[PDB]
Amino acid sequence: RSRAVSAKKKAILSAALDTFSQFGFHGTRLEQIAELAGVSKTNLLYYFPSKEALYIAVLRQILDIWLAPLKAFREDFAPLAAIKEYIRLKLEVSRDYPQASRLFCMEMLAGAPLLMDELTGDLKALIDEKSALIAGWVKSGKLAPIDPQHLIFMIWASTQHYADFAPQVEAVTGATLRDEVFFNQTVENVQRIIIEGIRPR
Amino acid sequence: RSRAVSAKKKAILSAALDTFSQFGFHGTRLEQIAELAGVSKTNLLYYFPSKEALYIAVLRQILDIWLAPLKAFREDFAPLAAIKEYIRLKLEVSRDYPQASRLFCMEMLAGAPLLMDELTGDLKALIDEKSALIAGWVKSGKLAPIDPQHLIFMIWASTQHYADFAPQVEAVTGATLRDEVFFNQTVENVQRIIIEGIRPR
């Protein structure tokens, strides 16, 4: 129920996200997340009883933000239209919450030492469910023949690139996703290549 | 053509790759690399005169392997044909050099503090050139109305994804790129999407 209690959790998690994304799992101290969140170690431990708990809690939060649109897919959506929106939402999150993207990525680079079993469990189940859905777009003629998972990965890869690889994107273009023009150019290009790449012909 | 020299340089670069990717730039000490490599610190310093130099060297290796195919591009090439093969080769290097790929990615996550000059200098310079080429194919009607820079980033993103997000790919797929049937499934699919997506119509 409680909004106060949620406000406090979100503050700890937000503070945690920022520290972890700078110092890493092993480099980060609970003492510092507490300082930045404006709460005591005791209070932090009361909500997240181990650094491992907290860290997993922030990573899960990113997944929920990311997977929302995909969880929202239903058997009778217009597929191409749904995918365009998913791409858009994913690029919005790369612009808005790039440190989220970065931490998730950091954890991957280390081998998902903490998040692995979460990927093999909840994530896989969710992807299996929506792969079937997509295969059914394919089976019914609404999409070109494409393997669902590689398509799902492609959306993830191509949208997260702009946060994760921002320094390189900036290096070559002079721009970041916070330039409204460049955001739009990016959305148009990622959408076109992907969507035209899966449009039925 | 000097036997023990060649061998030490390789021992140092490999030791450097492994150590940096565990502990990061600042977590690493030259002593560790030297130790791991079976050379003294002084010896190492003759091959590479600072920690910064060594680190740019390992990342410069994977940069040259990645870019090889792109430097190859010329005005008269069949554009689809060439993009097809580029995708194939990029995924090959994801299969074979995933640790190198991961380190490049980490440097990106860090803001590219140490690599920026390379990105803003030589790499930009190259991508500007090969952008012009690709820009050419589009102008002449040989490709769809695309922005070269973003097509290149999607190739990078989708192909490097299978190395950098390998645990997640395996998590949902049960496969890695070492599994031949998965490797081919990945290439066909990444190719199918990007290629169909940039085909002129």
Ligand SMILES: O=c1cc[nH]c(=O)[nH]1
């Ligand atoms: O959107 C998502 C969801 C899970 N993993 C990702 O890399 N991206």
Ligand SMILES: O=c1cc[nH]c(=O)[nH]1
């Ligand atoms: O393949 C490449 C080449 C340059 N930079 C990347 O990130 N990937």
